[PDB]
Amino acid sequence: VYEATPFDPITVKPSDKRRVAYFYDADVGNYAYGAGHPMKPHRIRMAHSLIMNYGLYKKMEIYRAKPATKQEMCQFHTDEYIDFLSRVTPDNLEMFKRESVKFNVGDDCPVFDGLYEYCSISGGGSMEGAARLNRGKCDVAVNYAGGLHHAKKSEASGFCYLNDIVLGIIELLRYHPRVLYIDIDVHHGDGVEEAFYTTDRVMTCSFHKYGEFFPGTGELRDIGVGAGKNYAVNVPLRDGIDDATYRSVFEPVIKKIMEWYQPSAVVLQCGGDSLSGDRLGCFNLSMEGHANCVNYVKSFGIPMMVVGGGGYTMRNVARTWCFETGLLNNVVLDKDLPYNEYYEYYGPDYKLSVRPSNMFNVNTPEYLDKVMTNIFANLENTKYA
């Protein structure tokens, strides 16, 4: 079904106007995963920096979400897990040599400092965003600090500890019947897909890389059990995909879902590790090929949340999120960077663009036709809302 269509530039939709909300806490940039770690909370600052030098503060309202407490966080995890997070510190780690192996928090995602505080900030942001949507003061909530979608119910796997996307979706589900979770990080969002695998009120659709790559999950045949048969859409792509192929796969699947699932609230996980040049990711996308998808989701005009995600090189991800926010506010942003405090990272051209490499594209069109054919054939049965 896939048909090669070239890259049409991204443009602002004229009529779709909406009163958004930007959540930012002034402290989260201090944390820092110890030494050499691919994800770090410096890139949460740089983004905000640009939004404050481009002057988007006149275009939308920025808040700071009061943090989540233990009872509120424990809507998903088990008491023991949340508590062990709230207690651990690198001085008395030795006291915990049983739990620190049960819960996986000592090896790939170490314990550094402010851990509980950082996780609480992200969780509180996500929840207050869903709530303000829910209550309805706004129509969008960006939360570039949250988005920890690998954190399972009782183990923190993949550098992320508190799985705030699930809390946000629950607070969304308190009022809205059906919610659609669109994931475009290169890895597979196994946390959310698992934690809504046996339900029909939340439909998760993840475009990820398959092969010997973290976390080895997300085949095409995982399509939900129980009452939630045919309510999960995993799309396994192959290496080296470019912006044109990614758009040509994305657009029809999302249109088909929103034709048949008819969600009342969208949650879009806007990760940045699908970009060209990341330490972890292997795709070859640009800035335009990544903003195009968020533009497409916004086009329909549903109350939505945009959440952050990965990010392994703070330059690409910082500029990408500044561009995505600009796009969400019906403003095409000027391609020249103003003067900001972190002006030094963006060399050598000192521009707002991200450049793709000449890595070799592997996604053969026949492969895509077979995948989209299987997915449409499955989704033929979600026609009843």
Place this chain on the structure above:
Amino acid sequence: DSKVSVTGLPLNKGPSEKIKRESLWNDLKTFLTENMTEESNIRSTIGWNGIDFENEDFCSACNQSGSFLCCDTCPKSFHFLCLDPPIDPNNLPKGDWHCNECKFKIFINNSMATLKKIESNFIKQNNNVKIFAKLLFNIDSHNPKQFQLPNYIKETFPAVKTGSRGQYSDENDKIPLTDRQLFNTSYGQSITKLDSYNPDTHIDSNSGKFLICYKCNQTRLGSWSHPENSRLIMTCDYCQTPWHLDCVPRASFKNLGSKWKCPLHSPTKVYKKIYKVWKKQRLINKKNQLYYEPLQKIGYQNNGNIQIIPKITQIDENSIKYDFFDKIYKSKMVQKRKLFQFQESLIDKLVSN
């Protein structure tokens, strides 16, 4: 403060001359924020308040590494779970911990006369178990260990061989790449996934001809002045019919966990769903297996462990031809009879009206 950081030197120090030589050629608006952020606590749940013998580095019970307690009286050490009963690391034994064997020795005081005496005592008490007596006495004197199958039963099957740590490995596991990680850091970008290099993967090595794709019958080799028409031929490990990664729709090179199997290997399980179980034995290899030729070749059913020839029950091609014709024609007959009874009940209920 003088302690080196990631940069190579103290933090309050500029670059050395060696680095700057080999690395050279020769108001803002986020002052604000504490004025625009106003807290949000609009959430629904805001009501919620919220003699020096050196010990081992191995579990001599399971010969794998871990966090282990060591012995005060013999060099043998175990993980905290490998004891009977297993000991909690939170409440360690107050004082020296003595293994089963050394505790045994000090209980017997190195006097075998008391050994034979208490053996006679034990066999005197429970004459009820006069046979198992020796073992019932000795069980408390041997140090624990995991349970390894006796080799005389691992030999009954040839395709069952132990892994590195004493684990089941039934030859469906590819191999220990080991040195391939050094290979993974290839000097020339030619990594395992075989990206941008498929000239001589489309061509058999020994023979020299082309590897055809059973489903589309073309080794699509493209042209390495125009590589966008390759199609990544890969070959199975059992039957070796070469397939396209686009015919068997999977998109990855199975290279780490197991060996890949074509869609041309029949079952190895059933799940009848109306839900019965296996139809296949294991590989009861060697001389011990008995092959049995039937005396009747038309309605003998016997198993699903058939072996085809020109307790494993051999059979000929024409026999299975006949048996499948039997299935087909009995199925068409019973389907016709079901339609017949359906229509005849229909006619009975019509003529009743």
Place this chain on the structure above:
Amino acid sequence: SQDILDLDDLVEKVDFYLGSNKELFTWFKNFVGYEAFGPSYKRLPKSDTFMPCSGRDDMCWEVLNDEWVGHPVWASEDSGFIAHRKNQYEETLFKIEEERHEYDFYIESNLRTIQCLETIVNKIENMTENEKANFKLPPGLGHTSMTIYKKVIRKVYDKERGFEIIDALHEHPAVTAPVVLKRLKQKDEEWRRAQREWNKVWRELEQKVFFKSLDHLGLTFKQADKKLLTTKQLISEISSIKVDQTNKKIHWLTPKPKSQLDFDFPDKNIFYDILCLADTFITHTTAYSNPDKERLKDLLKYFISLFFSISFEKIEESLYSHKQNVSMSLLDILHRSRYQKLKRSNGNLVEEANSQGIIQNRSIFNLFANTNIYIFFRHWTTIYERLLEIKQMNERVTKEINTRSTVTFAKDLDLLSSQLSEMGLDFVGEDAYKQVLRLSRRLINGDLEHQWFEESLRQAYNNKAFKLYTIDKVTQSLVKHAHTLMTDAKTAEIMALFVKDRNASTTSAKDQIIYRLQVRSHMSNTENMFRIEFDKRTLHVSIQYIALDDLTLKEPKADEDKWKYYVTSYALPHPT
């Protein structure tokens, strides 16, 4: 057959056996009258789905998921998760931003704590002595984040002494506040000056590596053009198309596939460019002498003139006009004696088969060739393909370079690598293609070391013009191949018959058979034969392979023409 396997499951397992044979498989289908299904999730028994889970209401119970679980070790087969390659320059670019993060992290933590310490000092100054006597500072210093200031203190104050001073701070504010505040300010100053003075070198270094570390399909390319261009590969591609066409011909519903290779030749100036390149190469080359130089120029010129039927004098005018902006028949050069002399001078069925087929005003032409002629033509069409790819990106790249808005805020601080503008290699807003050609001239001449060529082609063509990194080692190849057509007498005489045939203005099938047989006379049954069949109206070049018993021309469409070729093949008693 023993009612062990389902009906539809059998249908699916048979589809993989009869899928490409649609008739047989639909015959089988109409003849027969036609839980963990995901391999990644297990199921936990309903004895572990009961955990504390404090704050779940009724809705969070019916909607969440507790039993069905899955994790990346049962999916990875206990061994997996391979990683990408990340070529060297990319990790050399990683280390820089790692050092950047270290510095900026420490600086910003110091700032965030020092400001709160300063406002607490502002609070304590205006108080009285009795109030500073009883003042205590609560954990958090009245702020929201409790652990960062302890971190900076323990970094600066010898963590044991860090604890000492932090507790003496919370309990003795009035005596410890100013000293620690002043020391934090001093450390911030020293760190900041060192940070900027190192920040100079960081940029100086990442400038010489960035583009070289974003464009690396182009370094798997210094070898994938010296090793994947040999004749083995060149014949292998086309023989593979041939074999696959044959083994799909047995698939009778598949139509007769097209000839092996097709080519289009739209842009004509590139031939002039290639002749100038070859001339410059040999002019620099010292492995041949002057007569051989002139022989080489002459062969390239006149073969390109004839095979493409391009008027020679127009070629000459265009070539000399090219030489302005920088400051004889083919047989006559074919035979050494001719070249040296000219250089020192300065039933009814057979008859009807033979009568029909003499095409009038020949427009479709042929070349027959043994291997080395294919390799010469192959190098030629490859080099043309590359140069055309560029001259097609030309306009867009010019419009790009013309609009590169230099931020003078950076150039005053010399933040941009003037290296390639210092030697002036950068592409002015004029024709970037002409600049590429002239640069290649300089490289062949050696006027610029190779690395400068590579970096110029990276920056001017941001990522897409890497294939020209070999533009030298390819031309040397082509020219060298040309020399064979002079020396191996066999190839010279085959090319001789080529001159004859392409020079013939009217011919039938019969004379074509004669051409085939006279050429196959020169090479034995060990050599192969391929037709380079030329179409001048469309300028399309179609290369066909030949199994040594195959026909001269592609198989006809009608039965009458098939009988005609059969009878004209029997008319010459050669084995049909």
Place this chain on the structure above:
Amino acid sequence: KISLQIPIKLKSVLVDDWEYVTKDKKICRLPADVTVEMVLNKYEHEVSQELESPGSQSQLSEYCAGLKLYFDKCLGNMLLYRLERLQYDELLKKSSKDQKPLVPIRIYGAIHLLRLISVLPELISSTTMDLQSCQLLIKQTEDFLVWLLMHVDEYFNDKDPNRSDDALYVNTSSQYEGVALGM
């Protein structure tokens, strides 16, 4: 050197277990439906109903009780794979919290009894027992094996825990994995 010749089908069942508690990471569901005591009581009851000699039935009941007590005392020491030990410890904790001292025979299934039998030759040949006594033990356990192979499909059937219920095995969570294997 004594040798015990188990029927082939029970060797296949044992290897099937040996894979199940190895690289599929399942464990034995407990308390199973048919423990050791029910098995041996049924065996002895069925064999005493046919046997007429007194000494035959005396040695029968002696063998039963002896195998019972020795399984009871050895299970903890040498019948458990690495991955299972955690479940064992948790069972001890539960028993000592409920104040019922643990008996292996009334919880554990028959597969552990097959593990014991498969060991038995080494157990005997590591000792100084009488040749006639060890011989009668081999003959006896062989008759037990025969009676067990007559009913092999009452205990050792397969049920695929991941889909319906009450299979002889169950799956482990990642936390149980982490603690038991990688403590």
